[PDB]
Design a protein around this ligand. Structure first.
Ligand SMILES: Nc1ncnc2c1ncn2[C@@H]1O[C@H](COP(=O)(O)OP(=O)(O)OP(=O)(O)O)[C@@H](O)[C@H]1O
Ligand SMILES: Nc1ncnc2c1ncn2[C@@H]1O[C@H](COP(=O)(O)OP(=O)(O)O)[C@@H](O)[C@H]1O
Ligand SMILES: [Mg+2]
Lengths: 495, 55, 110, 165, 110
């Protein structure tokens, strides 16, 4: 008991009570402190500018909470640490993914032999400030399969009104943490529980494009790793072109991790080729690049120039980045086994679809064959032949219906034999009469379509508001055709 | 609602007017639902951006 | 006002979310002057939480309702049980069948 | 084969497959698409033949492959049927693998190292592999590559032009 | 305070090694954790973090004892079950199998 009381008094005393980290209030300072320390992401920058401005304008300092979400390795966690350095409050972070019991967030009852106060209390014990920038991360995949959700305790943690007097177990005291600045990360919003999802502001970090991905590579990756490994600019010059080649072939992803790791190995093998190697000044060159990384991990960009009858390029907003899934369909049996009969040619759907996509596909079929007879009564190719169909898996479930537009264009193309025009994406749902529908997550889609050399994107007309939010360079080349009624798509798709 | 947010953010009525037409325009165009919550988010957003525009 | 002493009661609110259902309760508490104390029960499945434990287990603590009574130090607050519809109901022991022993008007007195 | 080939000389009824081997789902997926592509290649290639169009057919694919790698075997099936279709013993000791698409465009598959080392001792001499996987075949220890001939391809119609000269 | 309250295992290793730069070798990390306290890994991370361990301080001896010159190492069968906060502090290296014509070379040599 004496030892437990020793621990308990020491814990209760260690907690700051009124300690308040000072808060810098130079707009001109934070501007540069951010812009020189991270690239892009104007909106988060602007938001924190908003926050500072509110607190300085609104007298005394205040806490808040926020929720970033985006593709992995996009800098989500490093910006947070930089922001903590910028705002002058102390920093801390801790994983939450896959945990079930709240005891780590809630300590223990302290009569147990192994009890210790919950981790946030450790952060208070280290972070002397009573208003640290806590950074919970990857809340979207918090472990919740066990009976009793930790997420309820999480909502108990977040909601400000009871944030004022939150109650930990190891010590029985309510504790205000309204001053504390939570932040949280997720690769997809939907998995997070609704009561918590509705409580918080959302922000979406986007995927960087090659042109800008380069400039960050040559400002914050190469210098950083070079200082990490002790090499100096006198030893390891890397022309931008080899970095381009690393991007073009050896890495293909929206994030900045795999390129990070591969650049690390290159620099490492360079340093090894200095510690004993003949050269005292590495200068990687594209021919020389093989020596450090071996043969390319990618060579094709797209799987081939489209076969005219029965395939179509399809954007899809997969859980990790955008992607260019191709829809593919084919004949299943000789067409004219009985010219005079009347038994309509069945579909075969494939692709491990969930049910909603399956009916969506069937609906698309119905509308397609409707339109086919509608404007081309004489044709019968699609009413009197079996067909098998495949939409490759990978799309986030919400995006499944969006394939339908392409799907229609699939059958009709095969029904006509006409090649689709080269490198011409499209997406979105249909509504059984050719009216086209809004779809989410346009940003990553346009990203990947730019990455695949597409030039003539076709989109629901309604969602144009977002396409004009893109950065001026991202729009370069691409020729959007806004449209709403699918009959337009039949015009542009087949001139 | 608006006065509450305005007190929440320290601004006073002299600093950030909101003509009613803009408000009806928001509810009719920029967010639709039986609940007002999302509209509450919108109004705070405009206020807080206005605050930055002041400071 | 016609019969002196204070009385208790149970009530339900329902409609689309965000109609103010939570906040107005606090307004009522400030009006009548009863104490306020929110308490969500969405998805709860530890029925013992509402009824404590045998007191011979290590780590036992009395159930929530005594904790809130200890907080308000007053016989007649206004609890705000929230989101009862989503209460956990599984094989591990459904608390909702234990709530009836609170919620029943006559028998709550003991 | 599983039923007489002319039980309905004019019958418009499918040559139903009857797969066996304790299949998983993804293998059913890959099997079905392989069935269809086979039927397509045959109509494009030997239009007069219709043995697969109208012949109920039992098929057996033994279990044991790692489940993620299970689609990789599809290409083998695609020739299996074709051999039986066209009545041609398959060419000797000519193993092949890799996933395929509806146009007969082979796709990369993993675990080449285990595959190569196991097939090496079977006496195989003429492997054929996706050209899209070829670099990994230029990373294995040289002694493994000595002996067996190797091919590389992207469109399966070439593979059909190797196995059956 | 406990009878026989010897310092934890690392101190014994420091005794056995009689030098400040051992090649300490943590082992079978993959399935550590999930104890009665949840895990001691936090303290291990305090060891791993150079500024914290630079004045590492056991319960048994009041003096902090620097261990910067230790060359810690880790091993685990697969890089999934390790708790993440330590995982980011370390690097991973995949280990392959052995060739049958070389497994014999081991069989003969050892
Ligand atoms: N805008 C950026 N500025 C500086 N570094 C960046 C940026 N974007 C990505 N990074 C780099 O990406 C790497 C990992 O980024 P970060 O951890 O912040 O990504 P992340 O999205 O948090 O990944 P995850 O959430 O999946 O951990 C860091 O080493 C970081 O240097
Ligand atoms: N009639 C109303 N008067 C005042 N506020 C309202 C009204 N209807 C909705 N609200 C607002 O709706 C928000 C949600 O309130 P609350 O009752 O806390 O949530 P819930 O809707 O889940 O009960 C509050 O910010 C509140 O101001
Ligand atoms: Mg991170």
């Amino acid at each position: 008991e004496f030892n437990v009381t020793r621990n308990y008094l020491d814990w209760l005393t260690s907690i700051p009570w009124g300690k308040y980290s000072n808060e810098n209030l130079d707009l001109a300072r934070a501007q540069a402190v951010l812009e020189e320390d991270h690239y892009g992401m104007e909106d988060v920058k602007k938001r924190i500018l908003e926050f500072i401005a509110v607190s300085q304008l609104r007298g005394s300092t205040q806490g808040k909470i926020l929720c970033f979400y985006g593709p992995p390795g996009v800098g989500k966690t490093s910006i947070a640490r930089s922001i903590a350095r910028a705002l002058n409050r102390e920093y801390f972070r801790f994983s939450v993914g896959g945990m079930t019991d709240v005891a780590e967030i809630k300590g223990h009852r302290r009569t147990y032999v192994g009890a210790m106060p919950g981790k946030i209390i450790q952060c208070l014990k280290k972070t002397k400030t009573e208003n640290p920038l806590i950074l919970i991360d990857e809340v979207d995949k918090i472990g919740r399969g066990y009976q009793g959700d930790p997420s309820s305790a999480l909502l108990e943690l977040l909601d400000p009104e009871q944030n004022a007097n939150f109650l930990d177990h190891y010590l029985d005291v309510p504790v205000d943490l309204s001053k504390v600045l939570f932040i949280c990360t997720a690769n997809v919003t939907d998995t997070i529980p609704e009561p918590l999802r509705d409580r918080m502001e959302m922000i979406n970090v986007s995927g960087y494009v090659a042109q800008e991905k380069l400039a960050i590579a040559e400002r914050y990756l190469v210098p950083q790793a070079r200082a990490l490994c002790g090499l100096d600019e006198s030893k390891a010059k890397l022309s931008s072109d080899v970095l381009t080649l690393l991007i073009k072939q050896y890495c293909r992803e929206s994030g900045v991790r795999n390129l990070q790791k591969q650049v690390e190995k290159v620099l490492r093998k360079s340093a090894y080729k200095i510690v004993s190697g003949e050269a005292e000044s590495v200068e990687v060159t594209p021919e020389n690049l093989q020596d450090f990384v071996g043969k390319p991990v990618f060579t094709v960009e797209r799987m081939y120039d489209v076969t005219p009858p029965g395939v179509v390029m399809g954007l899809a907003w997969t859980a990790m980045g955008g992607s260019t899934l191709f829809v593919e369909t084919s004949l299943r049996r000789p067409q004219d086994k009985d010219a005079k009969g009347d038994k309509d040619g069945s579909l075969e759907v494939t692709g491990q679809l969930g049910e909603v996509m399956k009916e969506s596909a069937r609906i698309a079929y119905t509308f397609a064959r409707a339109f086919l007879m509608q404007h081309a009564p004489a044709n019968d190719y699609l009413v009197t032949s079996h067909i098998h169909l495949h939409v490759p898996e990978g799309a986030t479930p919400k995006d499944g219906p969006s394939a339908g537009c392409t799907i229609v264009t699939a059958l009709l193309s095969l029904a006509m034999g006409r090649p689709v025009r080269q490198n011409l994406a499209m997406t979105g749902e249909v509504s059984l009469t050719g009216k086209i529908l809004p779809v989410g997550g346009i940003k990553e889609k346009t990203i990947a379509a730019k990455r695949a050399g597409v030039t003539c994107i076709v989109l629901p007309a309604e969602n144009k508001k977002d396409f004009y939010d893109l950065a001026a360079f991202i729009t370069e080349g691409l020729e959007v055709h806004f449209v709403e009624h699918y009959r337009e798509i039949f015009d542009i798709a087949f001139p």
